[PDB]
Amino acid sequence: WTATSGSCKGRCFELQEVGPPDCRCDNLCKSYSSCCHDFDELCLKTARGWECTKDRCGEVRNEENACHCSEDCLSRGDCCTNYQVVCKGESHWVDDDCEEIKVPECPAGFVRPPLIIFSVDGFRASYMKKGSKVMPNIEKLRSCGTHAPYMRPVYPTKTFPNLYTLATGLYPESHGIVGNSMYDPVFDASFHLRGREKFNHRWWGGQPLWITATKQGVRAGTFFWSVSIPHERRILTILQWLSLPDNERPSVYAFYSEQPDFSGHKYGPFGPEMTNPLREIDKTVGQLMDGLKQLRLHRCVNVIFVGDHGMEDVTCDRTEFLSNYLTNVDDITLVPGTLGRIRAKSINNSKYDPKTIIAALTCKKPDQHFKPYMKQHLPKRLHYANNRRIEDIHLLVDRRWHVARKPLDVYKKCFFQGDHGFDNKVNSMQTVFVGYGPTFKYRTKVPPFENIELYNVMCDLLGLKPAPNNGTHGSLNHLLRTNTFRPTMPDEVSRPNYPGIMYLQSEFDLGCTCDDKVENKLEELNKRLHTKGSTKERHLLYGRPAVLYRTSYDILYHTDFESGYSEIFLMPLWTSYTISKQAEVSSIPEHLTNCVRPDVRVSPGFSQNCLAYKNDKQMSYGFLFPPYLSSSPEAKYDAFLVTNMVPMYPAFKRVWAYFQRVLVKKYASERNGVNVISGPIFDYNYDGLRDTEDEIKQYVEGSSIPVPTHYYSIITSCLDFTQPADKCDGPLSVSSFILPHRPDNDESCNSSEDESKWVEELMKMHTARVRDIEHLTGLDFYRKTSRSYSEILTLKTYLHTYESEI
Ligand SMILES: *[C@@H]1O[C@H](CO)[C@@H](O[C@@H]2O[C@H](CO)[C@@H](O[C@@H]3O[C@H](CO[C@H]4O[C@H](CO)[C@@H](O)[C@H](O[C@H]5O[C@H](CO)[C@@H](O)[C@H](O)[C@@H]5O[C@H]5O[C@H](CO)[C@@H](O)[C@H](O)[C@@H]5O)[C@@H]4O)[C@@H](O)[C@H](O)[C@@H]3O)[C@H](O)[C@H]2NC(C)=O)[C@H](O)[C@H]1NC(C)=O
Ligand SMILES: O=C(NCc1cnn[nH]1)[C@H]1C[C@@H]2CN(C(=O)OCc3cc(Cl)cc(Cl)c3)C[C@@H]2C1
Ligand SMILES: [Ca+2]
Ligand SMILES: [Cl-]
Ligand SMILES: [Cl-]
Ligand SMILES: [Zn+2]
Ligand SMILES: [Zn+2]
């Protein structure tokens, strides 16, 4: 109940929220059914439309009009946006040539340049080029301001998860809005696009920009607009708020368009009916920019034009049904669509086995247009596991397809031609970014980035200190004319040991054999130097990674590679090596097939042993630096040191071996040498963060040798490929992966064929940013380069997607 007897007289779109049983006059009141009796009458005028005509010029102020063309409208702060154009012979904003905004041109009383977020739903990245002829206002913003060719959304590529990520800089797994539709098992409740449940505070974690702003003394316009407030009223309300007295006026604003998403669903991303929604958006943009020109704020305000996700061709006939795979289909709940989330229909039923579900959904049809995963095996780049609202069973659906439970769910629950929600690296899902204003750069294109990075920038644009988030602060400094923020490298927490030769062969009882006794002052002082680091500036090109946590570890030097060896985890945390274009692949000779040699620099007690692998019938081992790439038959003995050894499922060895024997060499040819850093990752609790020693869930049987959940590699070269990797003068190029360490190759339906048919494809799927690896290892890479730290931060956030041209 709400005693909605009070009035909105002069209170139209008030900024503070008055609580029950009183009536509200803020743009949220319609959603809570708590508006004052007269809200519509007074606060939602429509009469005479939204534009000034030649006959309205210098009229008599009639307060019933939606907007005004009277002489005092400028002062009242409520002219129609084209007022000055029709009446005072002024031109539209779009018609003026853009002049660089070298400094903020702000009216007296304005303490800082305001920020307006213009968000557009379902604005596919390629609309900027393909609709450019019908979007002149947006095209002016783009070309005069700062733009990316596209901006990467978060997964799932849906509205709620993406808007709240924009507002908070957090992955959905962290902010809690993991879908437009969710079931929380603790609440025993469901969150939907419709309904009032979504209005409970308990769903929304993190700290959104408008709370960040309020808590630091900066006032915000609302970020929630009612469906029945037309877009023209939204612009005018923003312009009214900009006319408020200094101490009442917000510094940050939001506008939201349901278009072009709404039509995209009906007509597909490029349906002929899509031209008009794009015209409308532009018109709205024009109105804002004209309005700001009137209030003399158009060279003062920073405007961000941004979308939440793109749009793909999807139709009903492209539906895979679970009923065609499962017999017991009625014992599951499925969150359907462009992604799939499965859980049991009841918990009172413990006969429910996710293992049988995954098995029944795996490579069962040659054409399968989805792939099942346990959430912990989803590509780490999606960061879509660490929340109780994410069901253990996930289906990644092919672009252009849907998953549903039964046929009845699709005809009784074709009316659509577009959808979104797919894997966030899919081209059709990419959306837009443009920044325009004093604080942004002039006529500047920047490389694509992820939307998790904007919260930091919007905090900078507003002199705010960002709440802790998943952006990398400084990675988008190259967008801005002037920077609030100077990023600095984290300090190293653990310094390495540099052990010498300290142990004799006979002190080791590892159960490891090797045929290596086939034995000159020249070539004996020479290999001492190798063990001292005479070739370190060859294999360690960007300085040692910094260990950002307290631990105990050794640096080990060799002819062909350098490693940071953990005495705790009994394996390297990282292994670094360079393969030049010239370098050659050789094989593991017949007498050295099972060679494992004790490392005389590390004690028996801090070594692995061959015995454990012999007892463990599920677990084999591999090497971080690959024998195949030794520079000499003499150097190859180094690769077999117990300290280069890591536990590997025979199934995983297949992936690893092909990477090491074929792909590294291929990459070195194409990129003119590559530097490779590889290592283990332990993330048993799938929070995307490194696990501590006392969080290890899997050991090699009867040992203290922990079993990695993943194996990473970072592959760096010169961006200018005419220069060798080891003599690069300028910017770097990088690609990385985090491969799940799994006992089977069930993920790859073609894995029974030659590795050259499926391995590279699996690696591509599990592509990664260096930054993701940093979170997972507690390491910090690229500490010693000739490049600026801001540029290195951009490099660290880069993701190689392997998608074709946008
Ligand atoms: C991306 O960036 C974020 C933010 O920096 C990182 O997440 C942070 O990581 C650490 C380590 O896991 C967590 O620290 C723990 O914090 C709790 C106390 O936490 C409470 O207070 C904080 C601060 O005000 C608040 O943010 C927390 O909110 C969580 O819980 C709410 C329910 O009570 C929920 O509504 C909200 O969405 C959020 O849940 C998420 O995080 C929790 C972990 O706390 C997780 O279980 C859940 O599934 C959600 O993902 C909370 O009230 C201490 O008691 C512990 O000792 C410990 O220090 C931070 O809480 C966490 N912050 C946030 C906002 O999630 C991510 O690790 C990073 N990801 C990557 C990949 O780098
Ligand atoms: O259900 C919806 N759309 C569904 C649809 C319609 N047509 N197609 N799909 C709407 C999206 C919501 C947010 N809001 C608002 O105005 O958003 C501004 C904002 C900006 C940022 Cl950057 C961050 C945040 Cl959190 C909010 C009105 C809401 C209801
Ligand atoms: Ca972890
Ligand atoms: Cl969803
Ligand atoms: Cl296999
Ligand atoms: Zn959307
Ligand atoms: Zn949509």
What Cα–Cα distance (Å) separates residue 510 from each residue in 506, 557, 597, 606, 617? 10, 22, 9, 11, 18
Q: Could you tell me the distance, in angstroms and rounded to a whole number, from the CA of residue 163 to the centre of ligand 2?
A: 7
Angstrom distance (rounded) from CA 676 to CA 623: 13
CA-closest candidate to residue 801, choices 760, 758, 757, 766: 766
Q: Could you tell me the distance, in angstroms and rounded to a whole number, from the CA of residue 140 to the centre of ligand 2?
A: 25
Is 593 an annotated catalytic residue?
no
Angstrom distance (rounded) from CA 285 to CA 681: 47
Q: Which amino acid is at 291?
A: G
CA-closest candidate to residue 549, choices 568, 536, 531: 568
CA-closest candidate to residue 126, choices 337, 354, 312: 312
What Cα–Cα distance (Å) separates residue 218 from each residue in 25, 212, 463, 464? 22, 8, 9, 8
Containing 477, the helix (H) or strand (E) segment is none
- Looking at the CA of 685, name the nearest ligand: 3
Q: Which two tokens stand for residue 770?
A: 């260096």
Angstrom distance (rounded) from CA 225 to CA 223: 7
User: Which protein residue has the closest C-alpha to ligand 1 atom 61?
Assistant: 174
Q: Is the CB of 163 under 6 A from ligand 2?
A: yes
Query: Phi/psi of residue 324, each to 5°?
Result: -85, 10
H helices of 465-539, in order, are 522-532, 536-539
Q: Is the CB of 207 under 6 A from ligand 1?
A: no
Q: Is the CB of 379 under 6 A from ligand 1?
A: no
Containing 678, the helix (H) or strand (E) segment is strand 674-681
Report the number of secondary-structure helices (H) and strands (E) in the chain.
Answer: 23, 29
The pairing of strands 332-335 and 252-260 is unpaired
Question: Which ligand 1 atom sits nearest the alpha carbon of residue 174?
Answer: 50
Q: Is the CB of 116 under 6 A from ligand 2?
A: no
Q: Is the CB of 232 under 6 A from ligand 2?
A: no
Q: CB–CB of 153/451 below 8 Å?
A: yes
Deposited experimental method: X-ray
For ligand 5, an ion, list residues with CB under 5 A.
651, 745
Angstrom distance (rounded) from CA 155 to CA 392: 16
Q: Which amino acid is at 5?
A: S
Out of 81, 146, 157, 159, the active site residue is 159
Q: CB–CB of 312/418 below 8 Å?
A: yes
Angstrom distance (rounded) from CA 791 to CA 362: 42
Q: Return the residue matching tokens 């028996």.
A: 604
Q: CB–CB of 508/604 below 8 Å?
A: yes
Angstrom distance (rounded) from CA 469 to CA 383: 14
Cα-trace Rg, the chain: 30
User: Residues 6 or more apart from 20 whose CB is under 8 A from it?
Assistant: 2, 34
Angstrom distance (rounded) from CA 231 to CA 258: 10
CA-closest candidate to residue 801, choices 769, 774, 772, 771: 769
- Looking at the CA of 208, name the nearest ligand: 2
Cis bond upstream, residue 260 (ω within 30) = yes
65 is in an annotated binding site: no
Q: CB–CB of 715/742 below 8 Å?
A: no
CA-closest candidate to residue 305, choices 288, 291, 324: 288
348 is in an annotated binding site: no
Report the length, in residues, of the chain: 806
Helix (H, G, I), strand (E, B) or coil at 742: coil
User: Which protein residue has the closest C-alpha to ligand 2 atom 26?
Assistant: 223
Q: Is the CB of 469 under 6 A from ligand 1?
A: yes
Angstrom distance (rounded) from CA 265 to CA 110: 42
Cα within 13 Å of Cα(526), Cβ side: 7
